[PDB]
Amino acid sequence: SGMYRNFLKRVIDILGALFLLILTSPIIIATAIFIYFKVSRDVIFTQARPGLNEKIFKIYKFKTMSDERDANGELLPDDQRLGKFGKLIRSLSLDELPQLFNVLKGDMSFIGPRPLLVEYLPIYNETQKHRHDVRPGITGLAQVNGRNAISWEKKFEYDVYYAKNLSFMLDVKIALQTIEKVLKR
């Protein structure tokens, strides 16, 4: 290919992220306000993950757990630092919204491999390393093919096949498989 792989896919990523950022902007400001006054005035925390050509970038996400400490300082267990409304924000995936800015700025695509830990970079073999030949995605070929089994090698098989055979057909197929995925629980 080339015409869609090297150009048109990025435009849909930019416009889509820009449209969705303006579309959910009241919810974004509302979420940040609640977190500011009841969780943490830092609101946003970043996540360093490998991306295109394995280059590290920070993933933006809303902070949901408090920054509470202990009499000795070792933080409370995760049970007591995550209130009911924090779980509600997590449940509605509102904390995930800042990643639209990641998609907009080029860190990620709308459809692509899942951003995983930096630890796995030396573990990937010569075939699985190719999953970083494309930008990571909010959804992708591996996310829609979940079969209640943790076969990392088969997830990586889907990842490598996607990076090699990126098509406008395939992207539409993933998009339909993603909305049909959410029609179920």
From TrEMBL:
Top-level class of the enzyme under EC nomenclature: transferase
GO molecular function terms noted in the UniProt entry: metal ion binding; N,N'-diacetylbacilliosaminyl-1-phosphate transferase activity
Keyword vocabulary terms for this entry: Membrane, Metal-binding, Transferase, Transmembrane, Transmembrane helix
EC number of this enzyme: 2.7.8.36
Membrane-spanning segments: 14-37
Binding site for Mg(2+): R90, D95
Membrane listed as a keyword: yes
Pfam families per UniProt: Bac_transf
Domain of life, source organism: Bacteria
Domain Bacterial sugar transferase: 9-184
Family: Belongs to the bacterial sugar transferase family.
Protein name as it appears in the record: N,N'-diacetylbacilliosaminyl-1-phosphate transferase
Taxonomic path: Bacteria, Pseudomonadati, Campylobacterota, Epsilonproteobacteria, Campylobacterales
